[PDB]
Amino acid sequence: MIYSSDLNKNLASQIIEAGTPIPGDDVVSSLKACYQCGTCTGSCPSGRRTSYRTRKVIRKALLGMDDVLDSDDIWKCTTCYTCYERCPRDVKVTEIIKTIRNLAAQKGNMAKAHKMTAMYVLKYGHAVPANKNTAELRKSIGLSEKAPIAQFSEKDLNEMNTLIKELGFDELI
Amino acid sequence: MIYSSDLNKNLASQIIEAGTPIPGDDVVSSLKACYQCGTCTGSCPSGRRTSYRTRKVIRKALLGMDDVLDSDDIWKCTTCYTCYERCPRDVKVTEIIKTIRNLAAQKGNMAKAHKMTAMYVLKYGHAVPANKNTAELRKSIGLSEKAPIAQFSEKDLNEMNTLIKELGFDELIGFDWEKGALKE
Ligand code: SF4
Numbered sequence: 001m002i003y004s005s006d007l008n009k010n011l012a013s014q015i016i017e018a019g020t021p022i023p024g025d026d027v028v029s030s031l032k033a034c035y036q037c038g039t040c041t042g043s044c045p046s047g048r049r050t051s052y053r054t055r056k057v058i059r060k061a062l063l064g065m066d067d068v069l070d071s072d073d074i075w076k077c078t079t080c081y082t083c084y085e086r087c088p089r090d091v092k093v094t095e096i097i098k099t100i101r102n103l104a105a106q107k108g109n110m111a112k113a114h115k116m117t118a119m120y121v122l123k124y125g126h127a128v129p130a131n132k133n134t135a136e137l138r139k140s141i142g143l144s145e146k147a148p149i150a151q152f153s154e155k156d157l158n159e160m161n162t163l164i165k166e167l168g169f170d171e172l173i
Numbered sequence: 174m175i176y177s178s179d180l181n182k183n184l185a186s187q188i189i190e191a192g193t194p195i196p197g198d199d200v201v202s203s204l205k206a207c208y209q210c211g212t213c214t215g216s217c218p219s220g221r222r223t224s225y226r227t228r229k230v231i232r233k234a235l236l237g238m239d240d241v242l243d244s245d246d247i248w249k250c251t252t253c254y255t256c257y258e259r260c261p262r263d264v265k266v267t268e269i270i271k272t273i274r275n276l277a278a279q280k281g282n283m284a285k286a287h288k289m290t291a292m293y294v295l296k297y298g299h300a301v302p303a304n305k306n307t308a309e310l311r312k313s314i315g316l317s318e319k320a321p322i323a324q325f326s327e328k329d330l331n332e333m334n335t336l337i338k339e340l341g342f343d344e345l346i347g348f349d350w351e352k353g354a355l356k357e
């Protein structure tokens with residue numbers, strides 16, 4: 001039983017707001033063109049082995065069911081862009097899902113594993129940083145012991161941190 | 174994922190077959206006129222407090238999902254006839270649900286409580302038979318100690334017992350006459 005009291009009339013507008021200016025007002029606004037045909041759901045590789053239905057994410061955004069932000073299903077999207085490519089109403093589906101994930105992240109719905117990966121990029125500058133075995137491996141192949149990356153350039157590490165602090169990505173985590 | 178191999182293309186026809194001649198071929202074949210509008214679901218008293226969705230029953234019958242016969246949901250219908258009354262395609266919804274319940278009963282999907290009630294009607298002739306307290310209550314308010322009903326007429330009790338046997342309703346509920354109770 002869904003009552004008007006259980007719905008947020010501004011959900012779509014709030015999703016568009018979050019998607020402005022990146023990926024864009026026009027891009028996220030495309031959710032309003034959806035005519036619930038299901039082409040996205042039938043194209044979804046994740047939907048073939050789970051309860052995830054791409055079309056229902058857009059339906060819930062239009063209807064105002066904010067529980068979609070607390071959903072585990074929105075995080076089952078692999079961003080394969082098959083829905084995006086086949087949508088007959090030009091809905092930028094994959095981008096709307098990512099924008100919805102941003103609001104889910106703001107509300108605290110981030111899996112610990114994802115927060116760990118984000119922490120590695122902040123601390124070490126890389127999601128998959130170099131290990132002790134890495135240096136040994138690279139030398140044997142005939143490459144530099146350490147790659148020319150941010151993990152070893154103190155300048156770049158502090159640059160990323162000031163940006164992460166300015167964006168509040170640290171507080172998001 | 175639903176494949177063609179998971180569906181029964183003859184489900185609708187089998188539901189209509191069961192509904193022939195009672196309540197009628199025309200009545201049960203009305204399921205084929207459904208256009209999935211949901212008026213029945215929005216009208217359903219049971220759907221407001223459960224996962225039961227009246228149009229999904231008709232959808233599953235048309236699609237060929239026979240798991241609908243194993244469903245607990247079809248037994249949540251109170252037969253209020255609100256869907257029947259409001260259907261814009263004249264689908265005799267309540268009758269289709271009852272016919273689907275007949276196939277569910279044939280497959281063994283019947284509750285002991287319902288089987289107990291059916292057993293009381295063939296054994297004592299009544300779903301709620303008279304007790305010792307009935308005789309006391311009735312005579313205390315001017316009524317006959319025993320009502321003029323089948324429970325006290327061996328003639329009418331035997332008539333029903335012959336019809337029950339002819340219809341095979343005794344076999345359906347699993348009632349044995351020698352044992353005098355529901356088998357298994
Ligand atoms: S495909 Fe485009 S239009 Fe059809 S449902 Fe998915 S999003 Fe809405």
Ligand code: SF4
Pocket residue numbers: 040043044045046047054076077078079080081082083084093094097
């Ligand atoms: S992008 Fe996400 S949603 Fe669209 S199809 Fe690939 S997985 Fe399913």
Ligand code: SF4
Pocket residue numbers: 206207208209210211212213214227228231256259260261262263264266
């Ligand atoms: S109301 Fe009549 S038509 Fe509309 S869904 Fe229920 S049965 Fe099908």
Ligand code: SF4
Pocket residue numbers: 213216217218219220227249250251252253254255256257266267270
């Ligand atoms: S008749 Fe059965 S299904 Fe139709 S509304 Fe009343 S309860 Fe719901």
Ligand SMILES: [Mg+2]
Pocket residue numbers: 051052053054056057073
């Ligand atoms: Mg979903």
